[PDB]
Amino acid sequence: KAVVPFSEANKKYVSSLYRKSLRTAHDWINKTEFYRVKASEIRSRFDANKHINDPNELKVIFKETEALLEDYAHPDPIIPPCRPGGSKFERNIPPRVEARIPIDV
Amino acid sequence: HHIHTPSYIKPPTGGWNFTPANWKQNTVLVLVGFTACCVGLYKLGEAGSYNPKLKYKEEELSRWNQSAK
Amino acid sequence: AFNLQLEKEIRSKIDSLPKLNNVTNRKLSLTDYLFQNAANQALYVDNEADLKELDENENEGWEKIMYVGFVPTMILIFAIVLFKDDKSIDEWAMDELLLRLKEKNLSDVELIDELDKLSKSHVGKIGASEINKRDAVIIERILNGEYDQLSGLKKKEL
Amino acid sequence: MLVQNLIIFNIIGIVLLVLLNNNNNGILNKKSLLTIKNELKLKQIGLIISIINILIIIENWIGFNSNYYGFQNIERFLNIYWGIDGISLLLVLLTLILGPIAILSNWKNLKGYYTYYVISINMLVILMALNFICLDLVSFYILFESTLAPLFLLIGIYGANNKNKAAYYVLIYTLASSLFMLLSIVIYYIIINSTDYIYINNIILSINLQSLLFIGIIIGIAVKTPLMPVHTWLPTVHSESPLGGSILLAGVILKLAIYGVIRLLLPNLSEISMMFTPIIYIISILTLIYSSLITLKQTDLKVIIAYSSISHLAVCMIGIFANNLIGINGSLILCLAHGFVSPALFILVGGILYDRYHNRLINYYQGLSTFMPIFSIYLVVFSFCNTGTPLSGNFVGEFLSITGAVIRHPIIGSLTAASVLLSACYQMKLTNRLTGSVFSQYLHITNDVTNREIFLLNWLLIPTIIIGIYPSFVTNILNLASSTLIYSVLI
Amino acid sequence: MILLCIFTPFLGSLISGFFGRYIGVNSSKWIVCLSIFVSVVSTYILFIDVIFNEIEYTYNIMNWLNVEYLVVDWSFTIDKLSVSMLVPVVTVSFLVHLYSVSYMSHDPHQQRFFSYLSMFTFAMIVLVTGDNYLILFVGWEFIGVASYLLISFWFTRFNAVKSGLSALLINRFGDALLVLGLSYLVLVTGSVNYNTVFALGSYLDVNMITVILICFLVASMAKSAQLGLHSWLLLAMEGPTPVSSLLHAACLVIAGVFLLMRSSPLLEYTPIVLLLILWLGGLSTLISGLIAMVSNDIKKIIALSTMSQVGIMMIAIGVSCYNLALFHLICHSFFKALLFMSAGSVIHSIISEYQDIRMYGGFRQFIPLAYTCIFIASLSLMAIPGLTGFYSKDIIIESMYGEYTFSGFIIYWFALISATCTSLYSIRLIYYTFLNNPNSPKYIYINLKENDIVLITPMIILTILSIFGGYLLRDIYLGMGSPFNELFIHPNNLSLIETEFSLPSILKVLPLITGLGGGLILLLIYEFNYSLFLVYNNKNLSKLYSFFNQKIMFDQLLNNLILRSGLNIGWLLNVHIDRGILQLFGPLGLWKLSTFISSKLNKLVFLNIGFILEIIVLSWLLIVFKVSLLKYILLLIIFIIL
Numbered sequence A: 001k002a003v004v005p006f007s008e009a010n011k012k013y014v015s016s017l018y019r020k021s022l023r024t025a026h027d028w029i030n031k032t033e034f035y036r037v038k039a040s041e042i043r044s045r046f047d048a049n050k051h052i053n054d055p056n057e058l059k060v061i062f063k064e065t066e067a068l069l070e071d072y073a074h075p076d077p078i079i080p081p082c083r084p085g086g087s088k089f090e091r092n093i094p095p096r097v098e099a100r101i102p103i104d105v
Numbered sequence B: 001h002h003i004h005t006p007s008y009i010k011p012p013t014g015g016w017n018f019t020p021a022n023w024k025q026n027t028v029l030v031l032v033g034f035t036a037c038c039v040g041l042y043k044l045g046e047a048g049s050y051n052p053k054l055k056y057k058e059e060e061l062s063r064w065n066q067s068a069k
Numbered sequence C: 001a002f003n004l005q006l007e008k009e010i011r012s013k014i015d016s017l018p019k020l021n022n023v024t025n026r027k028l029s030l031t032d033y034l035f036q037n038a039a040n041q042a043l044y045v046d047n048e049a050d051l052k053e054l055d056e057n058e059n060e061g062w063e064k065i066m067y068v069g070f071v072p073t074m075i076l077i078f079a080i081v082l083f084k085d086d087k088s089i090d091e092w093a094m095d096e097l098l099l100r101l102k103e104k105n106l107s108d109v110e111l112i113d114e115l116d117k118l119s120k121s122h123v124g125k126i127g128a129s130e131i132n133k134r135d136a137v138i139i140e141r142i143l144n145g146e147y148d149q150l151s152g153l154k155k156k157e158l
Numbered sequence D: 001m002l003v004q005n006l007i008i009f010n011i012i013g014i015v016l017l018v019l020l021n022n023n024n025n026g027i028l029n030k031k032s033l034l035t036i037k038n039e040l041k042l043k044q045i046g047l048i049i050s051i052i053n054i055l056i057i058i059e060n061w062i063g064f065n066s067n068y069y070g071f072q073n074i075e076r077f078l079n080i081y082w083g084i085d086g087i088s089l090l091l092v093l094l095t096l097i098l099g100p101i102a103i104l105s106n107w108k109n110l111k112g113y114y115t116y117y118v119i120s121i122n123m124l125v126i127l128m129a130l131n132f133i134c135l136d137l138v139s140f141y142i143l144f145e146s147t148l149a150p151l152f153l154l155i156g157i158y159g160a161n162n163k164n165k166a167a168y169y170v171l172i173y174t175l176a177s178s179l180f181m182l183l184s185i186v187i188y189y190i191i192i193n194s195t196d197y198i199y200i201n202n203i204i205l206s207i208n209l210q211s212l213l214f215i216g217i218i219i220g221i222a223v224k225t226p227l228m229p230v231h232t233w234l235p236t237v238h239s240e241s242p243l244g245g246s247i248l249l250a251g252v253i254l255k256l257a258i259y260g261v262i263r264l265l266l267p268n269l270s271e272i273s274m275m276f277t278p279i280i281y282i283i284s285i286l287t288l289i290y291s292s293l294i295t296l297k298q299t300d301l302k303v304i305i306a307y308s309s310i311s312h313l314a315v316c317m318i319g320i321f322a323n324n325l326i327g328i329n330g331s332l333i334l335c336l337a338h339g340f341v342s343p344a345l346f347i348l349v350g351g352i353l354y355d356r357y358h359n360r361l362i363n364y365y366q367g368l369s370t371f372m373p374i375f376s377i378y379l380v381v382f383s384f385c386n387t388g389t390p391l392s393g394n395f396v397g398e399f400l401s402i403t404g405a406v407i408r409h410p411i412i413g414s415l416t417a418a419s420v421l422l423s424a425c426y427q428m429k430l431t432n433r434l435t436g437s438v439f440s441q442y443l444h445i446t447n448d449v450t451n452r453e454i455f456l457l458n459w460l461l462i463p464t465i466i467i468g469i470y471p472s473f474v475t476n477i478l479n480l481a482s483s484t485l486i487y488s489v490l491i
Numbered sequence E: 001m002i003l004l005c006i007f008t009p010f011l012g013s014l015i016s017g018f019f020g021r022y023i024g025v026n027s028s029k030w031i032v033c034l035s036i037f038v039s040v041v042s043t044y045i046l047f048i049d050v051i052f053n054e055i056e057y058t059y060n061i062m063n064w065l066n067v068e069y070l071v072v073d074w075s076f077t078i079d080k081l082s083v084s085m086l087v088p089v090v091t092v093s094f095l096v097h098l099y100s101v102s103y104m105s106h107d108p109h110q111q112r113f114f115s116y117l118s119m120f121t122f123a124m125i126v127l128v129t130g131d132n133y134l135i136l137f138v139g140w141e142f143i144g145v146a147s148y149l150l151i152s153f154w155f156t157r158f159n160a161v162k163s164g165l166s167a168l169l170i171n172r173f174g175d176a177l178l179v180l181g182l183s184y185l186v187l188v189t190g191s192v193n194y195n196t197v198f199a200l201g202s203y204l205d206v207n208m209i210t211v212i213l214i215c216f217l218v219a220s221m222a223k224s225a226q227l228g229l230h231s232w233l234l235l236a237m238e239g240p241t242p243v244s245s246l247l248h249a250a251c252l253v254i255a256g257v258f259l260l261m262r263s264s265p266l267l268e269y270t271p272i273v274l275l276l277i278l279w280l281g282g283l284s285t286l287i288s289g290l291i292a293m294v295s296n297d298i299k300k301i302i303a304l305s306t307m308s309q310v311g312i313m314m315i316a317i318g319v320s321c322y323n324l325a326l327f328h329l330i331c332h333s334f335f336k337a338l339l340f341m342s343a344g345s346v347i348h349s350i351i352s353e354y355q356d357i358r359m360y361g362g363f364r365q366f367i368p369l370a371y372t373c374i375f376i377a378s379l380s381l382m383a384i385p386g387l388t389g390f391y392s393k394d395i396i397i398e399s400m401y402g403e404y405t406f407s408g409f410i411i412y413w414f415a416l417i418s419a420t421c422t423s424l425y426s427i428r429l430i431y432y433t434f435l436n437n438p439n440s441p442k443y444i445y446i447n448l449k450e451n452d453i454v455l456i457t458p459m460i461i462l463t464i465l466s467i468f469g470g471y472l473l474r475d476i477y478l479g480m481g482s483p484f485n486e487l488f489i490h491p492n493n494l495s496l497i498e499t500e501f502s503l504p505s506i507l508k509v510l511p512l513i514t515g516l517g518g519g520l521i522l523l524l525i526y527e528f529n530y531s532l533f534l535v536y537n538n539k540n541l542s543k544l545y546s547f548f549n550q551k552i553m554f555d556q557l558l559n560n561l562i563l564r565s566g567l568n569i570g571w572l573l574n575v576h577i578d579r580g581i582l583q584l585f586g587p588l589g590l591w592k593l594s595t596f597i598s599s600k601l602n603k604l605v606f607l608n609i610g611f612i613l614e615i616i617v618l619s620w621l622l623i624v625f626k627v628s629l630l631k632y633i634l635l636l637i638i639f640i641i642l
């Protein structure tokens, strides 16, 4: 679908793209003081393109952004233990609560 | 805590934090049972075991080699 | 034990509830299934269907047969493989081998001494084991000569 | 005494059940008294008859001599000579033990006509049991094919949705192939004027005639084990036949092919069997490997177990065609061990899950251990028996069969060891899924294994482990009988 | 006494397995711990009798296989090699069971866990004490059975379920080769008994010896996670940490080493196999350490260290130095179980229960006792002089150079790098978890507290064993001329003396310099110059980092190529054979043929005078025609059917 800047569906696409940018920075950079420098550099690059009207510019930028995010993706991201993909995910799931149906077998 | 559905799921191992009310009584019986035939293992082992390096004298083995020669 | 007077009570009470799907003092014997009149057999089922209608996985009718006929049958099979006085061919051959050693070495004082004191239960336990027995000369004599007679049956060579 | 009593008693049992249950057909429209509780009394009489048949073979077992060479209990009945040796004695007892199990597995999961089913089960058991005690080729063929008549009707009446397809498959695959075996039997009776076991065992035929006779017999045997590429009837028949039909098919019927090799090929066509062994090994090895890889892609629970049976019976065929005692004993023990584990896996897959959910698609079942822990224990235990884990009779059968193949043919017999890996690949892929993850969203929680289904599983597991730990109970009986099958002239 | 050492853990398995419902969670754990401890005291009593007094024990229960000449008995014998193997197994098993009492106290299923853990212990005792190879194979298989149930213990977790299957199937691949080696042993020697087979080692054909031990080598790779069959090892981390502390220390990962050391009377008479063991061990030491330097899960890092150290045992076996391999096998079980235990201590202590070292940092003060155990265990792992790892690992690395062959020289550098990489990934693990700036939330550090005394006690006991143990036991296994006839060394292969006297003094300290010197340089970069480790900048560094973090891309290659094509072959057979040509040459194909033929014949039955008169008169040609034309008439008739 075409991109309409300043729309609600554009404030969710850029926001998610910014999340994946910062998470990828966090996976690669494991020191908090070093992460803040990279986190601000990423944000300033978002601020530069913040005021753009032409969708024909945004789609060129949006396609390029995913090229960088996919290229810089960490092969081993950081996942919380109980989240999907974590070390404790689906461990000791409580059983389903439902009355047993008796059968004659 | 949670719901373990213990009404009908009673596996031999217990099913989600199962400790019966009479667990002290049963534990002594099992400890007696474990100890009783743990000695039975010892009594059997001492009777049945042997040293395979002392069953035949070295003089008996020299005759075997020559006879089989 | 049909007890027709008892069914009439059972039949009537189910009639006190016209609605449907909305006793332990009852039993039958082997002679009843073949000798009751056709009228009475109809009554018993009409109650049995309705008694069961007014209702886990027990008293199914097989437990007595399998635990009086089948499990003792497997026990008897287990006993036979355990305590039946049957020699196999490999167990016979070891006994025959010791017998021929005795016959070839009658003039042997040492060997016959061990053969006589070698009990029948330890014949298959020859060698190193927990039993303290003297078979050193017995093993010595088997290693010396060959006590089989296979060469005496193949009278044709190349 | 054995055959005469085993036939006369069962005829009286067949007639007794017919007389009781058919005395009221004549527009009585009554309610009877034997029809109550799904014909409980008629079921119980047939159950008792099956157990008594096990008692008859025992009375003749007490007098069996394991140190006698030749057939024992030699009897004449219906102008036919009947005899038993070490090999036959164990297969008869295996056949009769499964009789009560087949009846009890279908104790309450038939839509009706319980008297017919019980008679057919007892009729199938006796005909198969009598096939191990006949002493001529024609009597072997008569009992080999007589089972088709009740088995065809058993599938078509009590079968699943595709029962019509399965009934035709078993009748046509087995009858057409056995007629080729009949051609070889007719040739024996023409040139030798007898089909007696001992008479034909001493005759050496021309190497060209032995080839034609071997091919005729092997066609009938290869379809009934089954071997590739004539195996396509078995998965269809197993998925649609009733539970008792699957137990007898997977426990006895397939073992008649191995006994066919023992009687109809090894002692009479000895010279040509050595020629055919490389061909037999190639066919069996590819049967083992192909069936294991095909089993991976299956989606039906009862078809997965059906393909598992083909892989292990290829190993039995490999062992029996080894020309040594290790392979022959290993093949026979594997036949008995399979005769208990394979019916147990059909009870777990097609007798417990199917009786509760009536669907054999693999996609509906997972995480069963959450609400069926007892089922999961037996499922896991029998899965490791089915892959030849040590302490099970399957391993003792498999290890000696593989060892016998290696001794027979060191190069190509070594491929038999793929049974160890491939059997665990498809069997533990199914078990890891039924016992894995969250309890399935497509299932409602219901009862666990009942007392009857526990009883069936326990008494199929017990013989497997007793044989696995102390197989000398079986090897002592087989030792002198198996040693007669070896053909070699060492100079 | 011998029956007590072997079967007592099996009774503990049964009690928590079937009587767990009746004695409850608390008493089930301790009674199983009681059964293992009885085996501990029994083993120590037997250790004195066997090693120090040259007494052998043998209990022959009954016969197992009695098929003609092949006779296999249910016999268990305890000799120097067997009783030495029980020392790591039973001791570490006891200290892992006691560890699991408090570690698993929050788990809803504890009776089942201690049943599998004790059943695993019994199987390993069976493997090392059986009198023949078949009894070893019984323990060999049930170790894989128990490992499958332990790795998939949390069976609602999809990852644990598929990891348990992965470990079982790869080991079952090794079992299939082990069975073939046993079948070939029966073919060549007629026996599987150790006493028979080992007496014939010198007189048997080299090719027959090579075939049997190549089969043993493949089985050894699967269990010991050597290169090629090592993929399941890191998937085994899906199980509870006590499983990892046991499987990877004195258990299944060491079973492959034992099988090769047991077969030394045969293995010495085939140099080609020993050469393969040398290279396969050398490759796995190098690869494991390189992967472990860029790994981020704390248990994966320790698991890769286990693979690296087992490969150190393989190179020792390759140069026929069986005594060094057995000694390093015993010592490794002590400080590697400690490292797994002290890793599980940190994971429990942090309230988020993270396992990623990138989310750790600044833990040294808050958990000082856990840090001390890791520190000492790492130094023992790093073969710091004076410690137990120093007396067992330094000699093995130097023995590669003491071989003075081409292969020995190559593998010395592989071992040297692995020795250097061992220091590198140990310091990196310690820095990230303990010495780095805090990466966790502030709430984590105010709640970061040490665990109870039941968790602590086994770690202290193993900590002392990781300090002194190697020095005390060195002379039993490494002393010159010490009699260990179970481990046979051919006189042509004795290299312990040129190893001890001919090496340069620079090589005597070269592993120590690179590890200590390299470790300090690595530590400085993290603390002061971390900008060099932002490898996402450089594209070549990112690709080199990604290659090792993804474990030499082996798991991808195995799943995407070998496993995918293995399942696709079954699909092709299913589609084109079973549902394909066998239906065309079967029911579906014959149904179409029958329908075509029967439709033709149905058109020939109709009441018509002319039709039947023509056929009657046509048949008269059979009388006129000469009989040689019958087959042409037969061909013509089949044409008309079409």
Ligand SMILES: CCCCCCCCCCCCCCCCCC(=O)OC[C@H](COP(=O)(O)OCCN)OC(=O)CCCCCCCCCCCCCCCCC
Pocket (backbone or CB within 6 Å): C082, C083, D461, D462, D465, D466, D469, D470, E061, E062, E063, E074, E126, E138, E139
């Ligand atoms: C889940 C299903 C439930 C069933 C699970 C458990 C199944 C039952 C376990 C036992 C299996 C049955 C096998 C034992 C039956 C007895 C076999 C026997 O007859 O032993 C005879 C043996 C030697 O015979 P002989 O010297 O001739 O003297 C007797 C003369 N009649 O004389 C003897 O010395 C007897 C010695 C018997 C020793 C006890 C055997 C029990 C099993 C313990 C050993 C098992 C092997 C060790 C495996 C450990 C793991 C590697």
Ligand SMILES: CCCCCCCCCCCCCCCCCC(=O)OC[C@H](COP(=O)(O)OCCN)OC(=O)CCCCCCCCCCCCCCCCC
Pocket (backbone or CB within 6 Å): D229, D230, E584, E585, E586, E589, E590, E592, E593, E596, E597, E638, E641, E642
């Ligand atoms: C491992 C298992 C082994 C068991 C398998 C044994 C069976 C193997 C035989 C396989 C051959 C049959 C299977 C394939 C036949 C398919 C028939 C067919 O499709 O019809 C072909 C054609 C009609 O065309 P149509 O089908 O409509 O469309 C074309 C589709 N492409 O019409 C035709 O062309 C059909 C040809 C005309 C009929 C020729 C008749 C020749 C003689 C009869 C053959 C059998 C002889 C038996 C003799 C004794 C009989 C008592």
Ligand SMILES: CCCCCCCCCCCC(=O)OC[C@H](COP(=O)(O)OCC[N+](C)(C)C)OC(=O)CCCCCCCCCCC
Pocket (backbone or CB within 6 Å): D010, D011, D014, D018, D021, D022, D025, D113, D114, D115, D116, D117, D119, D120, D123, D146, D149, D150, D153
């Ligand atoms: C060992 C050699 C034995 C040979 C004798 C065979 C049995 C004879 C049965 C005749 C009486 C009868 O048709 O009776 C019918 C009985 C029982 O049916 P039911 O459920 O009561 O009928 C329903 C009545 N209701 C509605 C009141 C409940 O069916 C049987 O018995 C079936 C056995 C034969 C099946 C296989 C046929 C194969 C034919 C070719 C064999 C080679």
Ligand SMILES: CCCCCCCCCCCC(=O)OC[C@H](COP(=O)(O)OCC[N+](C)(C)C)OC(=O)CCCCCCCCCCC
Pocket (backbone or CB within 6 Å): B009, B011, B012, B013, B014, B015, B016, D369, D370, D371, D372, D373, D374, D376, D377, D380, D381, D384, D435, E013, E014, E017, E018, E109, E110, E111, E112, E113, E115, E119, E142, E145
């Ligand atoms: C050398 C031979 C050893 C023989 C004795 C070993 C101990 C036996 C333990 C029996 C009790 C048990 O484990 O089965 C019962 C437990 C039940 O789970 P729970 O922990 O009570 O939790 C209950 C909560 N659910 C319901 C969510 C699980 O498991 C299961 O159903 C889990 C499924 C896997 C089956 C495991 C079978 C293991 C058999 C070993 C095959 C060789």
Ligand SMILES: CCCCCCCCCCCC(=O)OC[C@H](COP(=O)(O)OCC[N+](C)(C)C)OC(=O)CCCCCCCCCCC
Pocket (backbone or CB within 6 Å): D165, D168, D169, D170, D172, D173, D174, D176, D177, D219, D223, D230, E586, E587, E588, E590, E591, E592, E594
């Ligand atoms: C000689 C080597 C061993 C072979 C043993 C015999 C195997 C015979 C093939 C199986 C046939 C079958 O089972 O017949 C059953 C099948 C059932 O077909 P269906 O699945 O319901 O599909 C058919 C319906 N549709 C497509 C609409 C879904 O009826 C047929 O097709 C009818 C043709 C019968 C031909 C039988 C001739 C047998 C000759 C045997 C020697 C060449």
